[PDB]
Design a protein around this nucleic acid. Sequence first.
DNA 1: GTGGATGAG
DNA 2: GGCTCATCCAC
Length: 511
Amino acid sequence: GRMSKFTWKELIQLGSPSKAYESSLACIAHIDMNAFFAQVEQMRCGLSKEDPVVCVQWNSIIAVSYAARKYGISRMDTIQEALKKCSNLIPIHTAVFKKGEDFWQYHDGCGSWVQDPAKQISVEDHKVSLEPYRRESRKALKIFKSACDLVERASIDEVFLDLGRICFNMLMFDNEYELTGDLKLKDALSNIREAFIGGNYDINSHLPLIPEKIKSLKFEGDVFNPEGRDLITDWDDVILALGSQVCKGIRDSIKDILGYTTSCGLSSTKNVCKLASNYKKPDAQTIVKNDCLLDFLDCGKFEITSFWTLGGVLGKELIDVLDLPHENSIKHIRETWPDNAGQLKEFLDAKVKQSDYDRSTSNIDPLKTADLAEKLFKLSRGRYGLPLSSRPVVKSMMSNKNLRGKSCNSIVDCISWLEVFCAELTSRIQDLEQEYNKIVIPRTVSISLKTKSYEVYRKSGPVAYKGINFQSHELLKVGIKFVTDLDIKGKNKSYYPLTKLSMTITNFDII
DNA sequence: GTGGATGAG
DNA sequence: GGCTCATCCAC
Ligand SMILES: Nc1ccn([C@H]2C[C@H](O)[C@@H](COP(=O)(O)OP(=O)(O)OP(=O)(O)O)O2)c(=O)n1
Ligand SMILES: [Ca+2]
Ligand SMILES: [Ca+2]
């Protein structure tokens, strides 16, 4: 007591873009668009957020609006099943490419669920286009980057934000913000601000106890506080409070510009944010204070298999290995080794040197069992902070069509599909340049397919650009040759009807 | 050198 | 259940 637990070094780190995630006062955020595809189709057709709309692909549902979820409809239910749950369901099929044409289109009012035999989208000669979701995604991304100086795109509809710089500056220099009436952050946070500019402190000194007045700062969103704890006790709570405020603005910016609802999760770690953002949906914001991490991790909805990269076999193994139960496993891993990663480390090292398994059907890499320990240790305590890295440069881009029926039955048929794959790849190449803001062009194409008997043929080679680097024509030119050379390689062999056909581009010159 | 595994969208 | 993405490694 009589002094804040944290130090200046830790608070200042929020200003550094490369060392802000390690800080204890770190304020990360994860934002996941609710029923994305379902939402975008809703917005496109000018429907309301409460409409039972659903994104359809062929016969399956790939996106379920929360409005339609009240009818018990779930992802991947066949349209037929859904309609038996909500006869007033509003199914919308994704845009599609028609064999031969170089552009995708929306066939609203058409679908397998439609009686009229004319209005149909035969999967036989159609390719799903995900471009619409791409664009919208790209938009939300530009708004995110304009509000935060560090955004990690985890997926097509997910992003992580490092509110470090914002919270810090807001904490030390914002003079507009109001907490209540006749009270501003500047006057409520005088000591700390006046001690900061003074700079008569040592980076390793401890921060002054938060001012009794700052406790009137309110959190924006749901603060996961089951054990009914004090919302504001130290700076991490202040930083988190401001963070939640700032965060609300950004999200609203999205609902206002694009009209997409979202769920968000704040905490001092990417992993906890990931869980928090999923805790409540739709259009919510779960806030996990550091002093509520365990209460949260032990609420009863998570498991070791509920964390990141552990929801698969690697997860089901760690259970049968560490001899973990099937309930309150996170609280377990924590209590069986409440000293340090070393405890659990030597436990694995000892559990791997016996007649329990072989180094073949296992997912653990013994020479790295030291990390696995430190990881699980931290994860079980909600302190495994990963840096908000950036998505690595793209290596390749494929565009295929798992052929069904006698669609691709000849060479021209192959070509017709090639036209589609190029139109799409070309489209995706532009989207790439927009992200890297640098010219991107494939230096090599590749054609592969699967014969009637499922055999694999494939020709790879370099694509040459001469004139205006038309990465939307010469690409197809090479594709045709290749698909034609393969047509010759299998003349009196099992070949047509092809069962699969795909075009891929690699070796990119990010000049 | 890749078809599968693995994990999540 | 359909289909897109990004490692990583025995055979
Ligand atoms: N097996 C899956 C999982 C997801 N998606 C698509 C549907 C969504 O538009 C986008 C989003 O991924 P989510 O898993 O986050 O799906 P939702 O947006 O539908 O629901 P929620 O926001 O509750 O996660 O990816 C898909 O085609 N196939
Ligand atoms: Ca998700
Ligand atoms: Ca989502």
